[PDB]
Motif scaffolding. Sequence first.
Motif, short mmCIF file in Angstrom:
data_model
loop_
_atom_site.label_atom_id
_atom_site.label_comp_id
_atom_site.label_asym_id
_atom_site.label_seq_id
_atom_site.Cartn_x
_atom_site.Cartn_y
_atom_site.Cartn_z
N UNK A 76 -16.38 -23.86 24.16
CA UNK A 76 -16.89 -25.03 23.45
C UNK A 76 -15.70 -25.90 23.05
N UNK A 77 -15.89 -27.21 23.11
CA UNK A 77 -14.94 -28.10 22.49
C UNK A 77 -15.56 -28.72 21.26
N UNK A 112 -10.45 -32.50 19.89
CA UNK A 112 -11.49 -31.50 20.10
C UNK A 112 -10.83 -30.13 20.05
N UNK A 161 -10.45 -26.24 20.60
CA UNK A 161 -10.80 -25.34 21.68
C UNK A 161 -11.26 -24.02 21.09
N UNK A 180 -1.56 -23.83 21.34
CA UNK A 180 -1.43 -24.75 22.46
C UNK A 180 -1.69 -23.98 23.75
N UNK A 181 -2.73 -24.38 24.47
CA UNK A 181 -3.20 -23.55 25.56
C UNK A 181 -4.30 -22.63 25.07
N UNK A 222 -7.06 -21.15 25.85
CA UNK A 222 -8.27 -20.84 26.59
C UNK A 222 -7.96 -20.49 28.02
N UNK A 223 -6.69 -20.56 28.41
CA UNK A 223 -6.26 -20.11 29.71
C UNK A 223 -6.06 -18.61 29.72
N UNK A 262 0.67 -15.76 24.03
CA UNK A 262 1.21 -17.11 23.87
C UNK A 262 2.72 -17.11 23.93
N UNK A 263 3.36 -16.22 23.16
CA UNK A 263 4.82 -16.17 23.14
C UNK A 263 5.38 -15.42 24.33
#
Lengths: 182, 142, 59
Positions: free
Chosen positions: B55-56, B66, B68, B88-89, B91-92, B134-135
């Motif tokens: 969903x956004x 929006x 994430x 940041x990112x 949903x990948x 993420x890191x």
Amino acid sequence: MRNYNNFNRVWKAPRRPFEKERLDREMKLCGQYGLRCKREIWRVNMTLSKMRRTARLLLTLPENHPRRLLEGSAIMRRCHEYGFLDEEKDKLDYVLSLTVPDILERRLQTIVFKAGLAKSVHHARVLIQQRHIAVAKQIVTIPSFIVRVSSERHIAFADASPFGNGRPGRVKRVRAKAAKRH
Amino acid sequence: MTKTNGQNAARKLVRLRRRNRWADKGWKRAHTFAAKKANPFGGSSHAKGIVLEKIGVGAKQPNSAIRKCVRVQLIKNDKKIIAFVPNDGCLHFIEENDEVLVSGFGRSGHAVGDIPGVRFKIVKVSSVGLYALYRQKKEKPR
Amino acid sequence: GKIHGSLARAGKVKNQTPKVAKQEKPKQPRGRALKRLKYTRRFLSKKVHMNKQPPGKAG
RNA sequence: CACCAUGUUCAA
RNA sequence: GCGCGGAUAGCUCAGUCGGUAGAGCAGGGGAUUGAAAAUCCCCGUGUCCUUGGUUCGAUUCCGAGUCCGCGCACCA
RNA sequence: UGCCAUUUGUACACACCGCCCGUCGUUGUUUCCGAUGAUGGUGCAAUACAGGUGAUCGGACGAAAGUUCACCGAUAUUUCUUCAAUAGAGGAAGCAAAAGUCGUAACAAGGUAGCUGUAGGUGAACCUGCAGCUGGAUCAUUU
RNA sequence: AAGUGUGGAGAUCGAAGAUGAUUAGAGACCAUUGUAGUCCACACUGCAAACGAUGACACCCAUGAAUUGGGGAU
RNA sequence: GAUUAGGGUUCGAUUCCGGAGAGGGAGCCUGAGAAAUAGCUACCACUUCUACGGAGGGCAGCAGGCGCGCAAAUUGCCCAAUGUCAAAACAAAACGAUGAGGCAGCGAAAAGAAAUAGAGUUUUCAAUGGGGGAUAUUUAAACCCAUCCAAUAUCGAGUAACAAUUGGAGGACAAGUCUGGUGCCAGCACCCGCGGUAAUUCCAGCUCCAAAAGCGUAUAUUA
Ligand SMILES: NC[C@@H]1O[C@H](O[C@H]2[C@@H](O)[C@H](O[C@@H]3[C@@H](O)[C@H](N)C[C@H](N)[C@H]3O[C@H]3O[C@H](CO)[C@@H](O)[C@H](O)[C@H]3N)O[C@@H]2CO)[C@H](N)[C@@H](O)[C@@H]1O
Ligand SMILES: NC[C@@H]1O[C@H](O[C@H]2[C@@H](O)[C@H](O[C@@H]3[C@@H](O)[C@H](N)C[C@H](N)[C@H]3O[C@H]3O[C@H](CO)[C@@H](O)[C@H](O)[C@H]3N)O[C@@H]2CO)[C@H](N)[C@@H](O)[C@@H]1O
Ligand SMILES: NC[C@@H]1O[C@H](O[C@H]2[C@@H](O)[C@H](O[C@@H]3[C@@H](O)[C@H](N)C[C@H](N)[C@H]3O[C@H]3O[C@H](CO)[C@@H](O)[C@H](O)[C@H]3N)O[C@@H]2CO)[C@H](N)[C@@H](O)[C@@H]1O
Ligand SMILES: [Mg+2]
Ligand SMILES: [Mg+2]
Ligand SMILES: [Mg+2]
Ligand SMILES: [Mg+2]
Ligand SMILES: [Mg+2]
Ligand SMILES: [Mg+2]
Ligand SMILES: [Mg+2]
Ligand SMILES: [Mg+2]
Ligand SMILES: [Mg+2]
Ligand SMILES: [Mg+2]
């Protein structure tokens, strides 16, 4: 599960973790006494806080009360024994005036600097932890060792240390092996 | 004009206080059972769920983005919730039909500031930590 | 349109960040010797600005 | 005492 | 069950009774703004069931046949 | 049409080119009602009734098998009660989201002073009747 | 106060409604009407800005005009 | 127990005491004591072996197993100690049983103590751990720690590379008017707010701040 050995906490973190007045005093206390972390200050806070709290309870009690003659002559005894108060201070109102640098002067890191066995206070903490100082012919490897008054006469180098009467340490000994294979 | 003295007036004071503690929204939530039976986590923390769809959610005024976030369906009680995916990112790192470990965030289930109607947060996806992905401490299995 | 963000734009800025690497920088002392390094610079070597920055585009 | 309704979203 | 009917851009849709295609939105870029929204301009663009009989050529004609609606039936 | 001063009211403050209310559209959410569907336990008491205990007979080889009766009673099934969960066409309420529509109700005497109660009407804010209130736009005028 | 029931009453004002007008629209204000109601009897309701937005009962509490009822001096 | 000036507010499945239960529910026998469950009988729900005739099960004991979940270890060694039982001291051909209970393995629940350097004139001098190991010591046996690098005779730091991290730098709240990128996007932000082409707040590099073998986050709960 059925083990009844006891354990409690010896330090407490302060309320208000970012006070600019407090953070400046404690960096002076880590520098002037060679301390690892702020937690070694914070147990000296709790050590002195508990003395300052019991001695303030006993002054609520009158004189010629049983809990002030006993146990008020105990807290004046351990101040005189560990060097917290000189022998003139005997009225119990001087425990309420003790400060954190009054307790930090009695650590074995400080006396080995003050007696003259080390150049700096960071020289003293190395030589304690590297097994060079004996208090009563007892190698003490603890920097937070609070030295009594009667123990000050007998602090010296250890009898097993290379600086005392023991065998030479590593850099001479591994060099004495390298000159032996030739 | 407020309260009663009297040396024998303790039953009046005990009854008076036990009814006025129900007006306290902390005392009433700690002593009624609509608190846990309607909490999507079973009165617990960090419930697992399966990602259903992405969903956004658009930010509230005066902000404009929006946000994430995924909609997940919890395993312990089959309750559909929407939970935010922080960074940041990120949903990948989440695909559909992924098991995710979902905590709340912040304010005891009260929707931390910008995001409307989202009060949970992804902590860990496919049993590897989402902030570690993420890191790039470590990467996803399979 | 009304909305300018999309789920397809996820991770836009972090992908196009230019990817600088950290430099060599030999290790600082640890533990009790790092407190010695803190104390000597802020006290023994004399408002007090702990991180004063060189002049930039503000002046 | 005729009629006289309204001015997009943040920001400065 | 037979009959009346409609399929043309990503979608939606108007057609000269028998000479070849209209917009618009969705899209990509500018003008505008303090950045936006609106707004204006410019750009991608629809082998039209399948086809036959083929008017110089079927989108526009007529009849066959997917598609999707509508008019109307045992006998006392 | 504007400007300046004083008084007064204001929910205005980039300040009336202000602020702001409800219906209606779009999206997302949590409840409630609802024919019907359905789940897990309790309690109630009704029969059936495994086992056993006591009694009565029995007496193969004193004393087993077995009779019969009473009692304790599991379980089974049904009857309502009660607690906790649950599916539902349809019908609503509420809330939340960048700039869609309709008016303009409130804030100034907001252009019909506002508001309370009640009753009826209306796309929608709302209007209208009756009795109240000033939190009013009057602390005041047969001495 | 509105509202309800059963009987009366029914002058005036008047929710609903009807006509005029104003208006971009007017379902509003304004004009003309007009039903229920307003008014009484007996029942019911018990919903007010039912206010002084101030619970009841005692106590102490400075000053100057007045005012209402009772009492006492001239 | 946690927190608490005082008054309090909370937690107590959990080691000690008591109560209750042994898959649910009964009913018993035996015994001084049981309505016993590593006793019996029966039913209900699951359940294992069978040569189909039959026979069995009861880990809320200790290890483990599958599920369930946000969530919790070794199918380890031993009776040496603490005890219990009992026909029983130890020893002698001749060692009572103990998953009670110890001991060790996993174990950043929580607690103590503590390294990651010192000293001096580019350049040297000393240190001693982590770690390797023993005539050995501990231990029931090992482990650990402790002691030791000759007692005639024992290995070893340099980039000590044997290398500290986790969260921040507008405010509260300690610490950058630094540089690069993006341009109400991506994201940050507990709250206030950042971001609309010069971002003190995002993504990064540097440099600082805080706590430090720790430090973030989430949910309960006290101030
Ligand atoms: N809103 C979320 C908040 O998060 C909190 O969660 C936790 C943390 O955020 C918070 O951690 C804080 C840390 O943020 C803050 N910077 C310093 C503080 N010392 C930490 O506290 C924690 O760490 C120390 C170790 O020193 C522990 O001793 C202490 O018990 C623990 N509370 O302490 C909590 C313990 O994990 C509260 N649990 C929660 O009630 C609150 O609502
Ligand atoms: N289980 C009962 C169901 O209720 C439904 O009714 C749905 C609607 O009638 C009703 O409407 C809600 C409304 O409550 C609320 N006031 C406004 C909200 N936007 C509406 O929501 C509904 O309509 C919008 C479309 O605009 C959808 O995006 C939304 O998902 C849907 N729930 O909310 C209900 C669901 O939340 C349907 N009648 C039908 O599916 C069924 O009866
Ligand atoms: N949300 C619950 C209720 O919604 C009602 O109002 C809701 C809507 O009727 C109202 O609609 C407004 C409208 O006022 C105005 N004329 C135009 C505006 N675009 C609308 O806005 C609405 O729609 C757009 C999407 O279309 C959303 O982005 C927006 O957040 C939402 N407010 O916005 C409100 C939604 O928050 C009640 N007025 C209010 O009492 C209450 O907030
Ligand atoms: Mg030594
Ligand atoms: Mg309009
Ligand atoms: Mg206006
Ligand atoms: Mg008029
Ligand atoms: Mg009239
Ligand atoms: Mg017990
Ligand atoms: Mg059962
Ligand atoms: Mg077990
Ligand atoms: Mg910048
Ligand atoms: Mg930065």
